[PDB]
Amino acid sequence: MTEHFITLSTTEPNNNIGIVKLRHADVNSQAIVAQIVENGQPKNFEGLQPFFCLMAQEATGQGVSEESVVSFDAKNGTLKYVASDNALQFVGRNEAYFSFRKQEGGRWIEQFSTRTFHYIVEKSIYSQPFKDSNYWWTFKELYRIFNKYIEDGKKSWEQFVEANREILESIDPGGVLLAKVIDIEKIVNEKVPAGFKFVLEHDSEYQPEVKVTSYKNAIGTETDGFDSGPVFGGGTIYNVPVSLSYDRQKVYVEMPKSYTLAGDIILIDDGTLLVIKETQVLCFKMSDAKITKGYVFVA
Amino acid sequence: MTEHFITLSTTEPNNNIGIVKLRHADVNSQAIVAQIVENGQPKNFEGLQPFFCLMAQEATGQGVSEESVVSFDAKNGTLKYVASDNALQFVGRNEAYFSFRKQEGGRWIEQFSTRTFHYIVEKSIYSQPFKDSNYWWTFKELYRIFNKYIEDGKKSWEQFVEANREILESIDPGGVLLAKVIDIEKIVNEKVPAGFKFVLEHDSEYQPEVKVTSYKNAIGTETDGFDSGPVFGGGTIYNVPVSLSYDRQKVYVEMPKSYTLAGDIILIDDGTLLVIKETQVLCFKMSDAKITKGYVFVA
Amino acid sequence: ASIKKVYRGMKNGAETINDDLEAINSELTSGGNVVHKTGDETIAGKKTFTGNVEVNG
Amino acid sequence: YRNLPFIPTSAMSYDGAWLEELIEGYQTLAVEGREMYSLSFETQDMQVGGVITNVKYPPRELTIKYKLEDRDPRVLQEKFDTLKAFLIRQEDVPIIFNDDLEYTFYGRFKTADNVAGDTNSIISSFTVLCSDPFKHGKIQSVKNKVIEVLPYPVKPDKLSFKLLTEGLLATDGNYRLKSSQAKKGDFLEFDFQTGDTFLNGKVNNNLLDLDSDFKNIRLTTGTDFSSSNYELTIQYRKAVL
Amino acid sequence: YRNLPFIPTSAMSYDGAWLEELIEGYQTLAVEGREMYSLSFETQDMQVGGVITNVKYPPRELTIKYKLEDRDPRVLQEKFDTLKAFLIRQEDVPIIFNDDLEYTFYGRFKTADNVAGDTNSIISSFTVLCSDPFKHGKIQSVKNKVIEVLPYPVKPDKLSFKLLTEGLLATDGNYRLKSSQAKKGDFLEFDFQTGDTFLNGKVNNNLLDLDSDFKNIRLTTGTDFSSSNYELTIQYRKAVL
């Protein structure tokens, strides 16, 4: 692949750089090896992700792009961005810059950009057609069609229940089955992992084993102070049945509906987390990984 | 982070000399390091709170822009002001200066300020308006609308299900019975080891422990080739609840009826076997023994 | 370097690859069965130097 | 109403102060010579063609077109008396333009074009001779090597050396800076290009550098001095023509 | 809409790059001096008429009329700063024109014409001194003799000889290249006109040629060196005025 060696500054204008010329149809070949300099010295963007930022066409307002840089060395301040379809979209002069951003999920912590540079895109035998940006239309049509499903879905469901009105009243006389099912769900809500979902964020890249225990009146949780409870040290310790579900650095702990406890989330600086609501404690023990954050699941 | 060094005077009639250039998208990085000098000697602003005063174009009043400087050494006449979101809001050619006041409470006493310096802000990909769906937008505007569609969409769905529940559920004496049963039927189909049985033949004479996991879009199982799926390297990993049954050199693994998968049986060199049906993969990990054969149980 | 085998439908596809790449890269800087430009190492076998050899120590 | 002083697009900052701000009625109309530079050549012509003996960089003078006006002829005369007093300087002065605020010229007032003795609204021009034709940017402190895009070779301002070994032998491939029998065992060496040499705190001009040392060193876009023997802090200013 | 850089009919290529491509708003309007050349004469006048002592070929300078324009005066200043940095060169640079792409000139930026400090759309010129007034075409490698239509006598670039007899005596009728006690029995020797001489692989600048040998040889349209004693490979470039 072709390498274009350039030095870019954050504090000085990038006018003295050579002519950066790239071909229109080049796929992943045309790479821009850039040295990041700040006040004459190389810049350390350690902990920050570099981005290629191409500004839209002033005339039409089309052609804006922000791309994650794959290969880069933060310690010495070098990056090797390979031009993409969106980068060599417009044949001719282009105005772009590199931004360095540290993002914590959705929120921005810090971001620093290099001074704008100019590059030219040469005409190729091939000319890639671009779809006129419609992010707003696509997003709202999806929202429109989903709300149409809610409107039509409520009407069709009411039509269904009301048509089967007599059947639903004559299904169970008195409540012989209802009283039986209420005894089944009583045990399903405490022995089977039911409706209670807790999320545990970790530092590990793998799937750590989580063990959950439930107990009342442990040290410092009793209502009338220390050693005021009936059983000193804590009551009966219940091993909570779990249905573990895993994502990158996230553990979805599904637990029975009886163990539902919304209290204070206390994180000890290791593989242990607690949910304390008055006297009731729900303990979360994790093996071979450290817990970073703990919260009740929300869609 | 990027620093900008300026030696500002209070006596020398500069008015416009002393340039500082930043850009729109630079959250908490680009900071101004200033040295305050009076009659050729550094000025001590002890007891006076420094302020960043900005004279923004087409956004003037009585309090055009004023922000308190937090990092400063009044003994040597040095300060460090980090440009805020408000500071970077005004894209163009602006004028700024630093104020120092000894405010008592409401009314001020002593307020001396430095000479004016040029504070210019360059546009970013975020500040520049771009054309989408035959309308002109900025990033922050679309990001707000999209996140609003997500927030309101989920609230609308949460209510759709809840309202449709109370039609069948509350409006019927025997309809509660119907609804409860479907819920129990699903928990038993997903969390309880029931309708699915798989046989694992081994070399061991004992009872080897088997661990079962289910995941979609695993490495090299995606529909449109490698790295074509929404979550690279496998989606969500579900720890399959199992009920183990043993015979001589045979392990009967009982699993919930939802994890029922009839696909290709792949045996790996060790105590590991996979059942792959397009994207859906069912993994079998056996400890202390070697899998020889694997097949779905038949009667 | 001790590396794990990569196969289709592997539990932890990306994780295994990362550990394999890190294990190989560790041997490129120090230890393993390769001679490095830094550190004290022991070499065995008939080594024929066709070029010029310079010793400063 | 408010009598606000007007500062034009291409205004001149002579010794940090604006002349249009100094003198009421003064206005800088145009500034010529800074945008384009000419070179001096020494040519030794022969039978076919001719070889260049030496290339010189002449000191350029920038022409400043101005307009001074006042209704009262007595005040107008006093206004010029102030203008002349400010311009006529014995030493070089730092010059910055309102359109090119990044750089700084270093010149002195030279000659003024003929001025009419009527109208009460006079337009003339005066020239400012710059001994150094380069305009210098901000002052930068860089450790060991210069990696910045330098359009012209730059003579440094200060070289702060910090020894680690026996002797000092600074090199970049072209220039060799020698210091035999130097202060070994971590001792700072200042090499102030726009003055003299220093040793730790005290001024040491006689002993500091060796006989075959260089003080005419120039920094290119890729100048490297980085060595395990010394920790260098280069102090330079970007020079442009 | 596409912001395509425009390349005019007679565009100049300074060091392989187009200035109009380099600088947005730059455009080469006209280029003068290349189309017609003047000669220098040494005349020894007498009673009737006057005889020409010597005919000299002066180094010609090509004047380049350009136009640079930008709405913003700050950017325009920066545009010139880039133009100067690119033009001002310490060594000679290869120049090619958009209308005469076949040949290549070798010059350097000399003097820039006066530039106005207003309008924001500037039109002026600059001279480019070519030390060698000949434009050189493609490099050609011909065996023994040159039969190509040469408009001007050309000094070669490389003369590759391959011996067959005892000694070397290259001749065309006017020039005699002699090498006594040469490497007999098929030995290649390079005579690099734009540097030094080579023997087989090693550099032999001191001994290769004899005292009465020629290195000022010029090739005409009908120059023949073909002989049974040596196999010559002439390397030359067509020179035009």
PDB file of C-alpha atoms in Angstrom, chain A residues 17-249:
ATOM      1  CA  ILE A  17       3.088  20.379   3.682  1.00  0.00           C
ATOM      2  CA  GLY A  18       3.357  18.899   0.220  1.00  0.00           C
ATOM      3  CA  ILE A  19       0.538  18.211  -2.196  1.00  0.00           C
ATOM      4  CA  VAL A  20      -1.423  15.272  -0.769  1.00  0.00           C
ATOM      5  CA  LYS A  21      -2.819  13.679  -3.941  1.00  0.00           C
ATOM      6  CA  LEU A  22      -5.010  10.563  -3.877  1.00  0.00           C
ATOM      7  CA  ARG A  23      -6.860   8.599  -6.636  1.00  0.00           C
ATOM      8  CA  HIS A  24     -10.705   8.317  -6.621  1.00  0.00           C
ATOM      9  CA  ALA A  25     -11.072   4.574  -6.822  1.00  0.00           C
ATOM     10  CA  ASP A  26      -8.330   3.160  -4.578  1.00  0.00           C
ATOM     11  CA  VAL A  27     -10.163   1.206  -1.868  1.00  0.00           C
ATOM     12  CA  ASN A  28      -7.873   0.504   1.121  1.00  0.00           C
ATOM     13  CA  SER A  29      -4.474   1.377  -0.286  1.00  0.00           C
ATOM     14  CA  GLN A  30      -4.009   5.218  -0.021  1.00  0.00           C
ATOM     15  CA  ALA A  31      -2.654   5.665   3.531  1.00  0.00           C
ATOM     16  CA  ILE A  32      -1.747   8.943   5.189  1.00  0.00           C
ATOM     17  CA  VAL A  33       1.169   8.548   7.627  1.00  0.00           C
ATOM     18  CA  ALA A  34       0.866  11.589   9.855  1.00  0.00           C
ATOM     19  CA  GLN A  35       3.173  12.901  12.576  1.00  0.00           C
ATOM     20  CA  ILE A  36       1.311  14.889  15.223  1.00  0.00           C
ATOM     21  CA  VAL A  37       3.206  17.873  16.516  1.00  0.00           C
ATOM     22  CA  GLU A  38       2.269  20.509  19.140  1.00  0.00           C
ATOM     23  CA  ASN A  39       4.402  23.657  19.640  1.00  0.00           C
ATOM     24  CA  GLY A  40       7.269  21.931  17.754  1.00  0.00           C
ATOM     25  CA  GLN A  41       7.333  18.810  19.991  1.00  0.00           C
ATOM     26  CA  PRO A  42       5.468  15.500  19.209  1.00  0.00           C
ATOM     27  CA  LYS A  43       2.017  15.168  20.840  1.00  0.00           C
ATOM     28  CA  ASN A  44       1.057  12.183  23.092  1.00  0.00           C
ATOM     29  CA  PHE A  45      -2.594  11.316  22.565  1.00  0.00           C
ATOM     30  CA  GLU A  46      -2.444   8.450  25.053  1.00  0.00           C
ATOM     31  CA  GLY A  47      -5.927   7.318  25.983  1.00  0.00           C
ATOM     32  CA  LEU A  48      -7.493   9.189  23.061  1.00  0.00           C
ATOM     33  CA  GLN A  49      -8.866   7.694  19.850  1.00  0.00           C
ATOM     34  CA  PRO A  50      -7.804   9.533  16.665  1.00  0.00           C
ATOM     35  CA  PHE A  51     -10.368  10.342  14.003  1.00  0.00           C
ATOM     36  CA  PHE A  52     -10.328  11.424  10.425  1.00  0.00           C
ATOM     37  CA  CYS A  53     -12.630  14.424  10.079  1.00  0.00           C
ATOM     38  CA  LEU A  54     -13.575  15.522   6.560  1.00  0.00           C
ATOM     39  CA  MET A  55     -15.797  18.647   6.457  1.00  0.00           C
ATOM     40  CA  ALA A  56     -18.855  18.868   4.135  1.00  0.00           C
ATOM     41  CA  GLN A  57     -18.878  20.770   0.830  1.00  0.00           C
ATOM     42  CA  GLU A  58     -19.519  24.413   1.537  1.00  0.00           C
ATOM     43  CA  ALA A  59     -21.690  24.844  -1.577  1.00  0.00           C
ATOM     44  CA  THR A  60     -23.937  21.753  -1.299  1.00  0.00           C
ATOM     45  CA  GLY A  61     -23.427  20.856   2.360  1.00  0.00           C
ATOM     46  CA  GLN A  62     -22.756  17.223   1.547  1.00  0.00           C
ATOM     47  CA  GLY A  63     -19.723  15.060   2.300  1.00  0.00           C
ATOM     48  CA  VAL A  64     -19.167  15.229   6.058  1.00  0.00           C
ATOM     49  CA  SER A  65     -17.339  12.276   7.604  1.00  0.00           C
ATOM     50  CA  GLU A  66     -15.892  11.119  10.974  1.00  0.00           C
ATOM     51  CA  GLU A  67     -13.886   7.874  10.872  1.00  0.00           C
ATOM     52  CA  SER A  68     -11.962   5.908  13.589  1.00  0.00           C
ATOM     53  CA  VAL A  69      -8.270   5.587  12.844  1.00  0.00           C
ATOM     54  CA  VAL A  70      -7.242   1.888  12.868  1.00  0.00           C
ATOM     55  CA  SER A  71      -3.379   2.006  13.059  1.00  0.00           C
ATOM     56  CA  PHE A  72      -1.688   4.644  15.263  1.00  0.00           C
ATOM     57  CA  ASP A  73       1.016   5.084  17.944  1.00  0.00           C
ATOM     58  CA  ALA A  74      -0.089   7.392  20.769  1.00  0.00           C
ATOM     59  CA  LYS A  75       3.314   7.492  22.595  1.00  0.00           C
ATOM     60  CA  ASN A  76       5.305   8.942  19.695  1.00  0.00           C
ATOM     61  CA  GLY A  77       2.359  10.768  18.086  1.00  0.00           C
ATOM     62  CA  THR A  78       2.046   9.023  14.718  1.00  0.00           C
ATOM     63  CA  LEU A  79      -0.955   7.706  12.838  1.00  0.00           C
ATOM     64  CA  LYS A  80      -1.578   5.834   9.606  1.00  0.00           C
ATOM     65  CA  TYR A  81      -5.067   6.605   8.272  1.00  0.00           C
ATOM     66  CA  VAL A  82      -6.178   4.736   5.121  1.00  0.00           C
ATOM     67  CA  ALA A  83      -8.565   6.753   2.979  1.00  0.00           C
ATOM     68  CA  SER A  84     -12.100   5.415   2.663  1.00  0.00           C
ATOM     69  CA  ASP A  85     -14.863   5.853  -0.011  1.00  0.00           C
ATOM     70  CA  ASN A  86     -16.283   8.831   1.997  1.00  0.00           C
ATOM     71  CA  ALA A  87     -12.804  10.422   2.160  1.00  0.00           C
ATOM     72  CA  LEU A  88     -12.122  10.258  -1.601  1.00  0.00           C
ATOM     73  CA  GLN A  89     -15.801  10.931  -2.490  1.00  0.00           C
ATOM     74  CA  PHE A  90     -15.303  14.319  -4.126  1.00  0.00           C
ATOM     75  CA  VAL A  91     -12.901  14.681  -7.030  1.00  0.00           C
ATOM     76  CA  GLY A  92     -10.849  17.798  -6.375  1.00  0.00           C
ATOM     77  CA  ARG A  93      -9.784  19.835  -3.346  1.00  0.00           C
ATOM     78  CA  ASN A  94     -10.845  18.589   0.089  1.00  0.00           C
ATOM     79  CA  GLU A  95     -10.627  20.196   3.567  1.00  0.00           C
ATOM     80  CA  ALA A  96     -10.073  17.833   6.517  1.00  0.00           C
ATOM     81  CA  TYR A  97      -8.429  17.524   9.975  1.00  0.00           C
ATOM     82  CA  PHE A  98      -7.651  14.832  12.603  1.00  0.00           C
ATOM     83  CA  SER A  99      -9.354  14.941  15.989  1.00  0.00           C
ATOM     84  CA  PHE A 100      -8.281  13.086  19.110  1.00  0.00           C
ATOM     85  CA  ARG A 101     -11.180  12.125  21.347  1.00  0.00           C
ATOM     86  CA  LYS A 102     -11.562  10.367  24.697  1.00  0.00           C
ATOM     87  CA  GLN A 103     -15.178   9.143  25.039  1.00  0.00           C
ATOM     88  CA  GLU A 104     -16.706   7.407  28.078  1.00  0.00           C
ATOM     89  CA  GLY A 105     -19.547   5.488  26.433  1.00  0.00           C
ATOM     90  CA  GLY A 106     -21.708   8.337  25.209  1.00  0.00           C
ATOM     91  CA  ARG A 107     -20.246  11.386  27.012  1.00  0.00           C
ATOM     92  CA  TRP A 108     -17.175  13.270  25.834  1.00  0.00           C
ATOM     93  CA  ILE A 109     -14.330  13.766  28.364  1.00  0.00           C
ATOM     94  CA  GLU A 110     -11.740  15.622  26.240  1.00  0.00           C
ATOM     95  CA  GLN A 111     -11.011  16.248  22.537  1.00  0.00           C
ATOM     96  CA  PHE A 112      -8.172  18.068  20.667  1.00  0.00           C
ATOM     97  CA  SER A 113      -7.978  18.681  16.874  1.00  0.00           C
ATOM     98  CA  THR A 114      -5.065  19.369  14.483  1.00  0.00           C
ATOM     99  CA  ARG A 115      -5.090  22.395  12.220  1.00  0.00           C
ATOM    100  CA  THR A 116      -7.013  21.878   8.943  1.00  0.00           C
ATOM    101  CA  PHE A 117      -5.118  20.459   5.964  1.00  0.00           C
ATOM    102  CA  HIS A 118      -5.892  20.291   2.253  1.00  0.00           C
ATOM    103  CA  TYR A 119      -5.762  17.266  -0.013  1.00  0.00           C
ATOM    104  CA  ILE A 120      -6.632  16.704  -3.650  1.00  0.00           C
ATOM    105  CA  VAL A 121      -8.526  13.734  -5.093  1.00  0.00           C
ATOM    106  CA  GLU A 122      -7.585  12.748  -8.669  1.00  0.00           C
ATOM    107  CA  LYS A 123     -10.179  11.538 -11.202  1.00  0.00           C
ATOM    108  CA  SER A 124     -10.298   7.778 -11.805  1.00  0.00           C
ATOM    109  CA  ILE A 125     -11.956   5.750 -14.652  1.00  0.00           C
ATOM    110  CA  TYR A 126     -14.532   4.712 -11.934  1.00  0.00           C
ATOM    111  CA  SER A 127     -16.976   7.172 -10.257  1.00  0.00           C
ATOM    112  CA  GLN A 128     -18.746   5.914  -7.129  1.00  0.00           C
ATOM    113  CA  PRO A 129     -22.370   6.959  -6.813  1.00  0.00           C
ATOM    114  CA  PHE A 130     -23.398   8.315  -3.407  1.00  0.00           C
ATOM    115  CA  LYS A 131     -26.812   8.184  -1.826  1.00  0.00           C
ATOM    116  CA  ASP A 132     -27.994  11.624  -0.756  1.00  0.00           C
ATOM    117  CA  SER A 133     -27.927  11.616   3.062  1.00  0.00           C
ATOM    118  CA  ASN A 134     -31.360  10.691   4.627  1.00  0.00           C
ATOM    119  CA  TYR A 135     -30.561   9.801   8.272  1.00  0.00           C
ATOM    120  CA  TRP A 136     -33.533  11.825   9.511  1.00  0.00           C
ATOM    121  CA  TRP A 137     -36.030  10.303   7.075  1.00  0.00           C
ATOM    122  CA  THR A 138     -34.951   6.699   7.757  1.00  0.00           C
ATOM    123  CA  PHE A 139     -35.019   7.236  11.528  1.00  0.00           C
ATOM    124  CA  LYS A 140     -38.436   8.859  11.585  1.00  0.00           C
ATOM    125  CA  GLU A 141     -40.074   6.403   9.118  1.00  0.00           C
ATOM    126  CA  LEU A 142     -38.949   3.604  11.425  1.00  0.00           C
ATOM    127  CA  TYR A 143     -40.501   5.593  14.318  1.00  0.00           C
ATOM    128  CA  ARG A 144     -43.612   6.217  12.200  1.00  0.00           C
ATOM    129  CA  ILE A 145     -44.124   2.578  11.211  1.00  0.00           C
ATOM    130  CA  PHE A 146     -43.487   1.449  14.846  1.00  0.00           C
ATOM    131  CA  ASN A 147     -46.142   3.887  16.109  1.00  0.00           C
ATOM    132  CA  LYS A 148     -48.519   2.606  13.360  1.00  0.00           C
ATOM    133  CA  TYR A 149     -47.989  -0.890  14.881  1.00  0.00           C
ATOM    134  CA  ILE A 150     -48.947   0.441  18.315  1.00  0.00           C
ATOM    135  CA  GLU A 151     -52.171   2.135  16.943  1.00  0.00           C
ATOM    136  CA  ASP A 152     -53.229  -0.911  14.843  1.00  0.00           C
ATOM    137  CA  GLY A 153     -52.010  -3.359  17.507  1.00  0.00           C
ATOM    138  CA  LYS A 154     -54.149  -1.863  20.282  1.00  0.00           C
ATOM    139  CA  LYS A 155     -57.261  -1.938  17.982  1.00  0.00           C
ATOM    140  CA  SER A 156     -56.663  -5.582  16.874  1.00  0.00           C
ATOM    141  CA  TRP A 157     -55.973  -6.761  20.489  1.00  0.00           C
ATOM    142  CA  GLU A 158     -59.173  -5.142  21.911  1.00  0.00           C
ATOM    143  CA  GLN A 159     -61.087  -6.795  19.020  1.00  0.00           C
ATOM    144  CA  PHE A 160     -59.629 -10.076  20.049  1.00  0.00           C
ATOM    145  CA  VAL A 161     -60.339  -9.976  23.809  1.00  0.00           C
ATOM    146  CA  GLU A 162     -63.928  -8.602  23.390  1.00  0.00           C
ATOM    147  CA  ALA A 163     -64.780 -11.280  20.778  1.00  0.00           C
ATOM    148  CA  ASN A 164     -63.628 -13.977  23.265  1.00  0.00           C
ATOM    149  CA  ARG A 165     -65.477 -12.221  26.208  1.00  0.00           C
ATOM    150  CA  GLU A 166     -67.786 -15.093  27.226  1.00  0.00           C
ATOM    151  CA  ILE A 167     -65.008 -17.661  26.837  1.00  0.00           C
ATOM    152  CA  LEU A 168     -62.735 -15.746  29.221  1.00  0.00           C
ATOM    153  CA  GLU A 169     -65.473 -15.543  31.884  1.00  0.00           C
ATOM    154  CA  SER A 170     -66.445 -19.252  31.629  1.00  0.00           C
ATOM    155  CA  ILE A 171     -62.828 -20.492  31.631  1.00  0.00           C
ATOM    156  CA  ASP A 172     -62.447 -21.174  35.362  1.00  0.00           C
ATOM    157  CA  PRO A 173     -65.356 -21.574  37.795  1.00  0.00           C
ATOM    158  CA  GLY A 174     -64.725 -19.926  41.173  1.00  0.00           C
ATOM    159  CA  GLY A 175     -60.947 -20.154  41.076  1.00  0.00           C
ATOM    160  CA  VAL A 176     -59.751 -23.747  41.444  1.00  0.00           C
ATOM    161  CA  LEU A 177     -56.978 -23.396  38.783  1.00  0.00           C
ATOM    162  CA  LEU A 178     -56.164 -19.818  39.766  1.00  0.00           C
ATOM    163  CA  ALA A 179     -55.386 -20.916  43.365  1.00  0.00           C
ATOM    164  CA  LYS A 180     -53.234 -23.768  42.027  1.00  0.00           C
ATOM    165  CA  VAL A 181     -51.287 -21.549  39.565  1.00  0.00           C
ATOM    166  CA  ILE A 182     -50.720 -18.902  42.299  1.00  0.00           C
ATOM    167  CA  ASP A 183     -48.868 -21.682  44.287  1.00  0.00           C
ATOM    168  CA  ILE A 184     -46.789 -22.596  41.181  1.00  0.00           C
ATOM    169  CA  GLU A 185     -45.798 -18.987  40.525  1.00  0.00           C
ATOM    170  CA  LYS A 186     -45.041 -18.615  44.238  1.00  0.00           C
ATOM    171  CA  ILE A 187     -42.218 -21.198  43.848  1.00  0.00           C
ATOM    172  CA  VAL A 188     -41.234 -20.077  40.320  1.00  0.00           C
ATOM    173  CA  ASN A 189     -40.692 -16.552  41.656  1.00  0.00           C
ATOM    174  CA  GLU A 190     -38.134 -17.751  44.213  1.00  0.00           C
ATOM    175  CA  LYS A 191     -36.458 -20.879  42.756  1.00  0.00           C
ATOM    176  CA  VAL A 192     -36.351 -20.071  39.020  1.00  0.00           C
ATOM    177  CA  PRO A 193     -34.495 -16.898  37.696  1.00  0.00           C
ATOM    178  CA  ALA A 194     -37.600 -14.844  36.880  1.00  0.00           C
ATOM    179  CA  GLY A 195     -37.969 -11.091  36.365  1.00  0.00           C
ATOM    180  CA  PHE A 196     -35.099  -9.602  38.399  1.00  0.00           C
ATOM    181  CA  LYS A 197     -32.153  -8.580  36.085  1.00  0.00           C
ATOM    182  CA  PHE A 198     -28.951  -6.990  37.524  1.00  0.00           C
ATOM    183  CA  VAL A 199     -25.993  -5.731  35.428  1.00  0.00           C
ATOM    184  CA  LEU A 200     -22.403  -6.069  36.605  1.00  0.00           C
ATOM    185  CA  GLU A 201     -19.663  -4.264  34.687  1.00  0.00           C
ATOM    186  CA  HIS A 202     -16.173  -5.783  34.886  1.00  0.00           C
ATOM    187  CA  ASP A 203     -12.556  -5.288  33.727  1.00  0.00           C
ATOM    188  CA  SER A 204     -12.206  -8.862  32.316  1.00  0.00           C
ATOM    189  CA  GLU A 205     -12.577  -9.597  28.568  1.00  0.00           C
ATOM    190  CA  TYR A 206     -14.045 -13.028  29.333  1.00  0.00           C
ATOM    191  CA  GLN A 207     -17.061 -14.469  31.265  1.00  0.00           C
ATOM    192  CA  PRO A 208     -16.510 -14.302  35.036  1.00  0.00           C
ATOM    193  CA  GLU A 209     -18.418 -16.629  37.410  1.00  0.00           C
ATOM    194  CA  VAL A 210     -20.942 -14.751  39.584  1.00  0.00           C
ATOM    195  CA  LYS A 211     -22.362 -16.181  42.825  1.00  0.00           C
ATOM    196  CA  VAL A 212     -25.315 -14.408  44.509  1.00  0.00           C
ATOM    197  CA  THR A 213     -26.374 -14.816  48.170  1.00  0.00           C
ATOM    198  CA  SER A 214     -29.279 -13.276  50.146  1.00  0.00           C
ATOM    199  CA  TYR A 215     -29.270 -12.654  53.918  1.00  0.00           C
ATOM    200  CA  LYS A 216     -30.908 -10.435  56.555  1.00  0.00           C
ATOM    201  CA  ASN A 217     -29.500  -8.704  59.719  1.00  0.00           C
ATOM    202  CA  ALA A 218     -25.775  -8.762  58.841  1.00  0.00           C
ATOM    203  CA  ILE A 219     -23.304  -6.527  60.767  1.00  0.00           C
ATOM    204  CA  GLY A 220     -24.296  -2.822  60.531  1.00  0.00           C
ATOM    205  CA  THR A 221     -27.669  -3.469  58.809  1.00  0.00           C
ATOM    206  CA  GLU A 222     -29.902  -4.060  61.883  1.00  0.00           C
ATOM    207  CA  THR A 223     -32.674  -1.495  62.529  1.00  0.00           C
ATOM    208  CA  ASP A 224     -31.816  -0.785  66.229  1.00  0.00           C
ATOM    209  CA  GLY A 225     -28.006  -0.651  65.683  1.00  0.00           C
ATOM    210  CA  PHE A 226     -25.172  -3.189  66.133  1.00  0.00           C
ATOM    211  CA  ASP A 227     -26.132  -6.583  67.775  1.00  0.00           C
ATOM    212  CA  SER A 228     -29.836  -5.599  68.075  1.00  0.00           C
ATOM    213  CA  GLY A 229     -31.182  -8.315  65.746  1.00  0.00           C
ATOM    214  CA  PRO A 230     -32.399 -11.806  66.763  1.00  0.00           C
ATOM    215  CA  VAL A 231     -29.438 -13.681  65.184  1.00  0.00           C
ATOM    216  CA  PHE A 232     -25.999 -12.076  65.661  1.00  0.00           C
ATOM    217  CA  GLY A 233     -23.779 -12.124  62.553  1.00  0.00           C
ATOM    218  CA  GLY A 234     -26.719 -12.549  60.165  1.00  0.00           C
ATOM    219  CA  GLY A 235     -29.758 -14.750  59.576  1.00  0.00           C
ATOM    220  CA  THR A 236     -30.269 -17.557  57.089  1.00  0.00           C
ATOM    221  CA  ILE A 237     -28.005 -17.333  54.007  1.00  0.00           C
ATOM    222  CA  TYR A 238     -29.900 -18.209  50.798  1.00  0.00           C
ATOM    223  CA  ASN A 239     -28.049 -19.252  47.635  1.00  0.00           C
ATOM    224  CA  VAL A 240     -29.734 -17.221  44.867  1.00  0.00           C
ATOM    225  CA  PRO A 241     -30.423 -19.198  41.626  1.00  0.00           C
ATOM    226  CA  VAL A 242     -28.887 -17.343  38.649  1.00  0.00           C
ATOM    227  CA  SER A 243     -29.190 -17.318  34.821  1.00  0.00           C
ATOM    228  CA  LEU A 244     -26.016 -15.675  33.638  1.00  0.00           C
ATOM    229  CA  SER A 245     -25.950 -13.754  30.351  1.00  0.00           C
ATOM    230  CA  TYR A 246     -22.736 -12.199  29.009  1.00  0.00           C
ATOM    231  CA  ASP A 247     -21.698  -9.226  26.843  1.00  0.00           C
ATOM    232  CA  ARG A 248     -18.316  -7.416  26.450  1.00  0.00           C
ATOM    233  CA  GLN A 249     -17.325  -6.330  30.015  1.00  0.00           C
TER     234      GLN A 249
END
